[PDB]
Ligand binder design. Structure first.
Ligand code: ZN
Length: 336
């Protein structure tokens, strides 16, 4: 029988044993719920590396039509999929205590609610289901937005995306990892860019914190803190994000230096930005990374790079895709 995940009882060990069984050639898995059945073909993401404080996190994806992705670390696992345009995450932490902390963290803003947030049991809490689209309606959270600032190689070039937990912030591994995954997926979906770049995300803590709620001033201080950091000398040519759970003033979800990374000339920590990592705004880091790689605001409301927050995870503008791919060392002759 085809392997299956029962969404009425999915636990960390369910997801871990299914995903640890995914070989280089992929594996069919059926997602099952009441009135719901989706067969997905899962493959390991061999292009993206993630360490969160040296903890290794692996990524998996269904086919494009499957609208399904997974995250797996030693401490947590995520299944996220889209149904009727809504992003549904099943979040499962291995240790009971942390799973309870996570459930209480997600339950707190809500104190039809089960359609937005539900603890999943097998008695014993095994995961939480969050429908962020229903959750934002119930919590009447604002639209939010952005507004930001100014030859196929033999092997893909490794580019580190160094993510720095803002001092005094608390972020959760499932939430940070989801942002990194959508950011990585958003780049690889463009012009076969896996042939050109392999993104390596790391998360550390920084002493820096924004002195105000102004995202512009915060980014100025962040980029300056990188230049003044001895640990970072010699790494001025990588990509940097300051991350927090929350947003900035004026419902600003993130900010970055526009068109500031190019594989030939990257330097001086110019390729820096800031991003929220909270679950209800997927794709913010993807959006800011697109800006860093040269993407500008697109007109299509279904584009990741639309000026307001849309919830879409993929570049649609041919012009942006060109600019991003060019900055990563591709050219039109290379095709897709
Ligand atoms: Zn923007």
């Amino acid at each position: 029988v085809t392997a299956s995940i029962d969404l009425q009882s999915v636990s960390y060990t369910d997801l871990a044993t299914q995903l640890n069984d995914v070989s280089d050639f992929g594996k069919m898995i059926i997602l099952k719920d009441n009135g719901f059945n989706r067969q997905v073909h899962v493959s390991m993401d061999k292009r993206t590396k993630i360490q969160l404080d040296n903890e290794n996190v692996r990524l998996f994806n269904g086919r494009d039509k499957d609208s399904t992705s997974f995250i797996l670390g030693d401490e947590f696992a995520v299944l996220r999929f889209y149904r009727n345009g809504e992003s549904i995450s099943y979040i499962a932490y291995k240790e009971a205590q942390m799973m309870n902390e996570i459930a209480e963290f997600y339950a707190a803003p809500f104190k039809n609610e089960k359609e937005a947030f539900e603890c999943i049991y097998d008695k014993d809490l095994v995961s939480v289901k969050i429908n962020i689209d229903k959750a934002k309606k119930i919590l009447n959270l604002p639209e939010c937005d952005y507004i930001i600032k100014t030859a196929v190689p033999s092997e893909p070039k490794t580019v580190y995306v160094i993510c720095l937990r803002e001092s005094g912030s608390t972020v959760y591994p499932n939430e940070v990892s989801a942002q990194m995954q959508d950011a990585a997926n958003s780049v690889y979906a463009v012009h076969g860019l896996k042939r050109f770049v392999n993104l390596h995300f790391v998360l550390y803590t920084t002493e820096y914190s924004c002195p105000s709620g102004n995202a512009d001033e915060g980014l100025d201080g962040f980029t300056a803190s990188l230049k003044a950091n001895p640990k970072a000398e010699g790494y001025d040519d990588q990509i940097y994000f300051l991350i927090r759970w929350g947003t900035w003033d004026n419902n600003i979800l993130g900010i970055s230096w526009l068109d500031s990374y190019n594989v030939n000339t990257a330097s001086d920590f110019k390729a820096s930005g800031m991003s929220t990592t909270q679950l209800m705004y997927p794709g913010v880091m993807a959006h800011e990374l697109g800006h860093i790689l040269g993407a500008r605001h697109a007109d299509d409301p279904k584009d990741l790079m639309y000026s307001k927050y849309t919830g879409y995870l993929f570049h649609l503008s041919e012009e942006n895709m060109y600019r991003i791919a060019k900055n990563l060392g591709w050219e039109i002759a290379d095709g897709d």
